[PDB]
Amino acid sequence: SSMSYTWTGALITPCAAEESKLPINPLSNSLLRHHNMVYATTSRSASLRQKKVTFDRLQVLDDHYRDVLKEMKAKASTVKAKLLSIEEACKLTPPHSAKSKFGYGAKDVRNLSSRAVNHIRSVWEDLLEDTETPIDTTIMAKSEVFCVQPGRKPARLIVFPDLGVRVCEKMALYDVVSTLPQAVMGSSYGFQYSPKQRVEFLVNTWKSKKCPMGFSYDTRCFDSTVTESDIRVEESIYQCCDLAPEARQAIRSLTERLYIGGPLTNSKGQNCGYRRCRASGVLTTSCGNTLTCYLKATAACRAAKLQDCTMLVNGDDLVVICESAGTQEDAAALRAFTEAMTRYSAPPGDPPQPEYDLELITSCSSNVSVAHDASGKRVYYLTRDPTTPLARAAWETARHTPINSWLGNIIMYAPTLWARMILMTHFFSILLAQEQLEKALDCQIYGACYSIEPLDLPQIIERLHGLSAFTLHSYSPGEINRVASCLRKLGVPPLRTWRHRARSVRAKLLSQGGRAATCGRYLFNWAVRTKLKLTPIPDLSGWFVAGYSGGDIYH
Numbered sequence: 001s002s003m004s005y006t007w008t009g010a011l012i013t014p015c016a017a018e019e020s021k022l023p024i025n026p027l028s029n030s031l032l033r034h035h036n037m038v039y040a041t042t043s044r045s046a047s048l049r050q051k052k053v054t055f056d057r058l059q060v061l062d063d064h065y066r067d068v069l070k071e072m073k074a075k076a077s078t079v080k081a082k083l084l085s086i087e088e089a090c091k092l093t094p095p096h097s098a099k100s101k102f103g104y105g106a107k108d109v110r111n112l113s114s115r116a117v118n119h120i121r122s123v124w125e126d127l128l129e130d131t132e133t134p135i136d137t138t139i140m141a142k143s144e145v146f147c148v149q150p151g152r153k154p155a156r157l158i159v160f161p162d163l164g165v166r167v168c169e170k171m172a173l174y175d176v177v178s179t180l181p182q183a184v185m186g187s188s189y190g191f192q193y194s195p196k197q198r199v200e201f202l203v204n205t206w207k208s209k210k211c212p213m214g215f216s217y218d219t220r221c222f223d224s225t226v227t228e229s230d231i232r233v234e235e236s237i238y239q240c241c242d243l244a245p246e247a248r249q250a251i252r253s254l255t256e257r258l259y260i261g262g263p264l265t266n267s268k269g270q271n272c273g274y275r276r277c278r279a280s281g282v283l284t285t286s287c288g289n290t291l292t293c294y295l296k297a298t299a300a301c302r303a304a305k306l307q308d309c310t311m312l313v314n315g316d317d318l319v320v321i322c323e324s325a326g327t328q329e330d331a332a333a334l335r336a337f338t339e340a341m342t343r344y345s346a347p348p349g350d351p352p353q354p355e356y357d358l359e360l361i362t363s364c365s366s367n368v369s370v371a372h373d374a375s376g377k378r379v380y381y382l383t384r385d386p387t388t389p390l391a392r393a394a395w396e397t398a399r400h401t402p403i404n405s406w407l408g409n410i411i412m413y414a415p416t417l418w419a420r421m422i423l424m425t426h427f428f429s430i431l432l433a434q435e436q437l438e439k440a441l442d443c444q445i446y447g448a449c450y451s452i453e454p455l456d457l458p459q460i461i462e463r464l465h466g467l468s469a470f471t472l473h474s475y476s477p478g479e480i481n482r483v484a485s486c487l488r489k490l491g492v493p494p495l496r497t498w499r500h501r502a503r504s505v506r507a508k509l510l511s512q513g514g515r516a517a518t519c520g521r522y523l524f525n526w527a528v529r530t531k532l533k534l535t536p537i538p539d540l541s542g543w544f545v546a547g548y549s550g551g552d553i554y555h
């Protein structure tokens, strides 16, 4: 056997009191009235999750797999990757990253304190001198907010090494994980695209097929499906880069000591068990998942004899668009695809279904939809079911949180009916009332943390989505119906209320002048009776280059 996890009986413990409900009394009640619908996961459901993620992996590799792997390595062998200096790696550490057990924290790392850098150097030397000893990790239950569904999701489990080790991962591997995936997978590497670019790729791919069929593939507990073999195959791809000798060794040692597995320690310092699958909180998780998903999926496409496939991969998230052969034979091919993924260790959660309308394909929890701009031209844009974004926004209104998913959701889904009507109106109202428009806030974009001034949103949205994001109307019936239904479920006030609120915050923003007034003019033009003509506004290099989920990255 090869078990994803072995358990001792020690509990997955919280490090502090955990909240699972919105506070009693108002705050987010003006956002949504059905507060009992909103919950946050805690350590109290850790054991339900442990049951789902724990199983034996039988893996059977074939010629298709080996062929694809060799192709990927040929492309990987064009890459030259550089060691990051200590200073560069320290600057990529988020200011609230989990402190080291060696008596320094994220702020000390970022300041290059004596104790921090002493430890980081000792850890680096230790990777070079010790090639075997498993590296300790901490296991914790993740706190995430959802809406109930007619019951409740258990907490996800996060597994991560000590801050000192995380700084060493950046030095050995940041350049690799930021450059290799695109070198290997080209246009298939989803993290290279902004939302507009993603939409474009999907639409152009779909229109390029004589008769398109598409499907999303959901692997059940992907991280747990990843084998020790997969993780060594992943290293085999990394080792094709030109690398400094210390980087080669650090990659070698990290692979055997950390990435393939190791001991799990709870917040109380007790041994909880042992992992032999992917850790969610290491630098290589997004890259590793993306490579492994792509490899397995490309080989399965061949085994299924699916014709003219174009794939788009974002970590464990997969969508394929191919040439239809007919209904019955697409169904059969998709079953063979699944059978081969299952042999490769990646069985499905939701059984995949062939889809003949691009708009009904959900990938990265998002779908393509269509609206029209001021002049009436069709504009394709990315949207999703707003339930989770709105539940999270109510939580962040009522309780202090370091990550502001509302701000990330505005950036990624600015064109949508729901982000504009609700999230912009609600959060600009609070910010303006609290006199904090100017204050920068943390949010996440493809797993990395960015500090963003709310007043820069008009500029950010134009660059990313186009001027069109401020003028979209004539949304599709499908999208409208989903929005309305979600908003009934959560008890969100009607359009009239948001329109009034938006007119009011728009008035106050305009009177302040400057970036505030720009926010009023562009973000809230939908709210006014007599629309204004909107025009172009007088460094996003690192944005939408790569994914870093769990990889402890800041900018």
Ligand SMILES: CO[P@@](=O)(Nc1nn(-c2ccc(-c3cc4nc(C)cc(N)n4n3)cc2)cc1C(=O)O)c1ccc(C)cc1C
Residues within 6 Å of the ligand: 416, 417, 418, 420, 421, 472, 473, 474, 475, 476, 480, 483, 484, 485, 487, 488, 492, 493, 494, 495, 498, 526, 527
């Ligand atoms: C300016 O012209 P619009 O009025 N045009 C439209 N409005 N809608 C629209 C607006 C709100 C809701 C809705 C349903 C619901 N149900 C509950 C329970 C609660 C709440 N709040 N809602 N809201 C449903 C449809 C669609 C269109 C269109 O052009 O296709 C408009 C309003 C806002 C925004 C951000 C953008 C536009 C273009």
